[PDB]
């Protein structure tokens, strides 16, 4: 795990990355290379980056949401589907690429790409519907009061 | 020391002697010098003592076969590169430019009131020559008018340029009208001023010469010593050995009226006479780790930003540090760009 305190402080969000490496002299698999060497080291193909996610317990969640008043105010006005719209469009784009690959594969190593594409589509649609549900709840809570 | 010796060989070769080698064999021995030159592992040091040797050769007009000088630097330029011979190219071009400048100045003199002495000057250039104004000097009353004249000629031709005359490296010729016969001696500007001080009176004390010429103590003492060596200034006690005579600002030195040297071309102007690298390497490796892919110019700028604020390192030292770090396989060149480094640990 590699952290970057300076960018974390200057950007307001944590900069973290988890990585794993390949065996010595094993797996040399085959605009991308230029940026890849620009932001990674010279050994771009020698290691890969895991997808980092965070979690918390129920007591931790309760204590955090009950710590300051700025955490339930920011939930009733979080306004999703606009904070991270660009991430949604990127997810739709690489979803389209994955669907094209699955269509190519199913016409004729053994991974069943269609199932993974469907899982990704269900995930992103579920985030979209969650955002819409938050907006609907906010509208029913605030707009539909006092005529 | 061997590079220095080879360069002194070069000096003889090009300088000047009683016998002038023919142009055919002059390049023949120069080719042999370049045969061993490439074998020399370190090239930077050779330019260091070649610059001052060449500067003394040209500023005194003691160089022989100036055409061979052009070909000599021409051979060097294709050997190591433009950057290695950039400073020496300035020295040769300054001599050629000033030689043309003298011809136009003479023509300008005829169309106006002529001078009283034959005046020639080498303009040189600032920033490329090792010389610098180091000794204060009072301009003699006889060498002032021509002085001003040339300044005018250098103000109408070139605007925005300021001249800084170097009296230490200036020579001249002085005629006499009071000796037994008509003599014509050669002396530097300092000796000329000292000998022209005696134009109106007979004897002066040392302090009376120091306050009239404003020359500093050491150079003035040396000039008086060499003048006494030429037995042109005679002390009161003739029998005292000149070398062991202790000079004080009270002796009344008088011009030797009875000078009777047989030669009429007396030449009294005879000449006289690690830790940082580790810091640069550390700065380079740190900058390379921070910026994974960099250009040579950007790397130089970053090194100057981070480290040059401390001791102002020289750019060739940083380039050599980059080369040795490349040899240590700390950072590698990238194909497709001549000047591009990637931090390969």
Swiss-Prot record, chain A:
Covered residues, full protein: 168 to 333 of 334
Keywords of this entry: Acetylation, Cytoplasm, Cytoplasmic vesicle, Hydrolase, Metal-binding, Metalloprotease, Nucleus, Protease, Signalosome, Synapse, Zinc
Primary location recorded for the protein, binned into one broad class: cytoplasm
UniProt subunit comment: Component of the CSN complex, composed of COPS1/GPS1, COPS2, COPS3, COPS4, COPS5, COPS6, COPS7 (COPS7A or COPS7B), COPS8 and COPS9 isoform 1. In the complex, it probably interacts directly with COPS1, COPS2, COPS4, COPS6 and COPS7 (COPS7A or COPS7B) and COPS9 isoform 1. Interacts with COPS9 isoform 2. The CSN complex interacts with the BRISC complex. Also exists as monomeric form. Interacts with TP53, MIF, JUN, UCHL1, NCOA1, HIF1A, CDKN1B, BCL3, GFER, PGR, LHCGR, SMAD4, SMAD7, ID1, ID3, ITGB2 and TOP2A. Part of a complex consisting of RANBP9, Ran, DYRK1B and COPS5. Interacts with IFIT3.
Something else known: The CSN complex is associated with some 'Lys-63'-specific deubiquitination. Such activity is however not mediated by the core CSN complex but by the BRCC3/BRCC36 component of the BRISC complex.
Record comment regarding domains: The JAMM motif is essential for the protease activity of the CSN complex resulting in deneddylation of cullins. It constitutes the catalytic center of the complex.
An example molecular function term from Gene Ontology annotations: metal ion binding
Gene label: COPS5
Keyword Acetylation included in the entry's annotation: yes
Name the record gives this protein: COP9 signalosome complex subunit 5
Taxonomy of the source species: Eukaryota, Metazoa, Chordata, Craniata, Vertebrata
Organism: Homo sapiens
Functional summary from the UniProt entry: Probable protease subunit of the COP9 signalosome complex (CSN), a complex involved in various cellular and developmental processes. The CSN complex is an essential regulator of the ubiquitin (Ubl) conjugation pathway by mediating the deneddylation of the cullin subunits of the SCF-type E3 ligase complexes, leading to decrease the Ubl ligase activity of SCF-type complexes such as SCF, CSA or DDB2. The complex is also involved in phosphorylation of p53/TP53, c-jun/JUN, IkappaBalpha/NFKBIA, ITPK1 and IRF8, possibly via its association with CK2 and PKD kinases.
GO cellular component, as recorded: chromatin; COP9 signalosome; cytoplasm; cytosol; eukaryotic translation initiation factor 3 complex; nucleoplasm; nucleus; perinuclear region of cytoplasm
Compartment(s) where it occurs, according to its Swiss-Prot or TrEMBL record: Cytoplasm, Cytosol; Nucleus; Cytoplasm, Perinuclear region; Cytoplasmic vesicle, Secretory vesicle, Synaptic vesicle
UniProtKB/Swiss-Prot annotation, chain B:
Superkingdom of origin: Eukaryota
Tissue expression summary: Expressed in lung fibroblasts.
Entry comment on modification after translation: Neddylated; which enhances the ubiquitination activity of SCF. Neddylation prevents binding of the inhibitor CAND1. Neddylation leads to structural rearrangment in the complex that allows interaction between the E2 ubiquitin-conjugating enzyme and the acceptor ubiquitin. Deneddylated via its interaction with the COP9 signalosome (CSN) complex.
Cross-link (Glycyl lysine isopeptide (Lys-Gly) (interchain with G-Cter in NEDD8)): 289
Domain Cullin neddylation: 275-335
Function, as annotated: Core component of multiple cullin-RING-based SCF (SKP1-CUL1-F-box protein) E3 ubiquitin-protein ligase complexes, which mediate the ubiquitination of proteins involved in cell cycle progression, signal transduction and transcription. SCF complexes and ARIH1 collaborate in tandem to mediate ubiquitination of target proteins. In the SCF complex, serves as a rigid scaffold that organizes the SKP1-F-box protein and RBX1 subunits. May contribute to catalysis through positioning of the substrate and the ubiquitin-conjugating enzyme.
Written domain comment of the UniProt record: The Cullin neddylation domain restrains the RING domain of RBX1 in the E3 ubiquitin-protein ligase complex; this restraint is removed upon neddylation of the cullin.
UniProt record similarity statement: Belongs to the cullin family.
Subunit structure: Component of multiple Cul1-RING E3 ubiquitin-protein ligase complexes commonly known as SCF (SKP1-CUL1-F-box) complexes, consisting of CUL1, SKP1, RBX1 and a variable F-box domain-containing protein as substrate-specific subunit. Component of the SCF(FBXW11) complex containing FBXW11. Component of the SCF(SKP2) complex containing SKP2, in which it interacts directly with SKP1, SKP2 and RBX1. Component of the SCF(FBXW2) complex containing FBXW2. Component of the SCF(FBXO32) complex containing FBXO32. Component of the probable SCF(FBXO7) complex containing FBXO7.
Record-given protein name: Cullin-1
Name of the coding gene: CUL1
Residues of the full protein shown: 417 to 776 of 776
């Amino acid at each position: 795990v590699v952290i970057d305190p300076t960018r974390t402080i200057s950007a307001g969000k944590v900069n973290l990355g988890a990585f794993r490496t390949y065996p010595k002299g094993y797996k040399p698999p085959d605009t991308i290379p230029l940026n890849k060497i620009e932001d990674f080291g010279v050994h771009c193909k020698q290691y890969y980056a895991l997808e980092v996610s965070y979690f918390k317990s129920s007591l931790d969640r309760k204590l955090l949401e009950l710590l300051w008043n700025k955490y339930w105010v920011n939930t009733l006005s979080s306004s999703s589907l606009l904070t991270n719209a660009d991430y949604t469009t990127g997810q739709v784009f690489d979803l389209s690429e994955k669907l094209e690959q699955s269509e190519a594969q199913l016409g004729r190593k053994s991974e069943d790409k269609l199932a993974k594409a469907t899982r990704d589509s269900c995930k992103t649609t579920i985030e979209a519907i969650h955002g819409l549900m938050s907006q609907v709840i906010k509208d029913k809570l605030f707009n539909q009061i006092n005529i | 020391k061997s590079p220095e010796l080879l360069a002194r060989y070069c000096d003889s070769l090009l300088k000047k002697s009683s016998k002038n080698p023919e142009e055919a064999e002059l390049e023949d021995t120069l080719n042999q010098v370049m045969v061993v030159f490439k074998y020399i592992e370190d090239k930077d040091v050779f330019q260091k003592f070649y610059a001052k040797m060449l500067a003394k050769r040209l500023v005194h007009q003691n160089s022989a076969s100036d055409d061979a000088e052009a070909s000599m630097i021409s051979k060097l330029k294709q050997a190591c590169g433009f950057e290695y011979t950039s400073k020496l190219q300035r020295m040769f071009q300054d001599i050629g430019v000033s030689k043309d400048l003298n011809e136009q100045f003479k023509k300008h003199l005829t169309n106006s009131e002529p001078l009283d002495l034959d005046f020639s000057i080498q303009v040189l250039s600032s920033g490329s020559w090792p010389f610098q104004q180091s000794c204060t000097f009072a301009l003699p009353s006889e060498l002032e008018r021509s002085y001003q004249r040339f300044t005018a000629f250098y103000a109408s031709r070139h605007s925005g340029r300021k001249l800084t005359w170097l009296y230490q490296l200036s020579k001249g010729e002085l005629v006499t009208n009071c000796f037994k016969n008509r003599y014509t001696l050669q002396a530097s500007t300092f000796q000329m001023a000292i000998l022209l001080q005696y134009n109106t009176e007979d004897a002066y004390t040392v302090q009376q010469l120091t306050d009239s010429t404003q020359i500093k103590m050491d150079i003035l003492a040396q000039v008086l010593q060499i003048l006494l060596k030429s037995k042109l200034l005679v002390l009161e006690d003739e029998n005292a050995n000149v070398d062991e005579v202790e000079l004080k600002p009270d002796t009344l030195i008088k011009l030797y009226l009875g000078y009777k040297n047989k030669k009429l071309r007396v030449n009294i102007n005879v000449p006289m006479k690690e830790d940082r690298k580790l810091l640069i390497q550390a700065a380079i490796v740190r900058i390379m780790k921070m910026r994974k892919v960099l250009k040579h110019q950007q790397l130089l700028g970053e090194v100057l930003t981070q480290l040059s604020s401390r001791f102002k390192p020289r750019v060739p030292v940083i380039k050599k540090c980059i080369d040795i770090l490349i040899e240590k396989e700390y950072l590698e060149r990238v194909d497709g760009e001549k000047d591009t480094y990637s931090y390969l640990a």
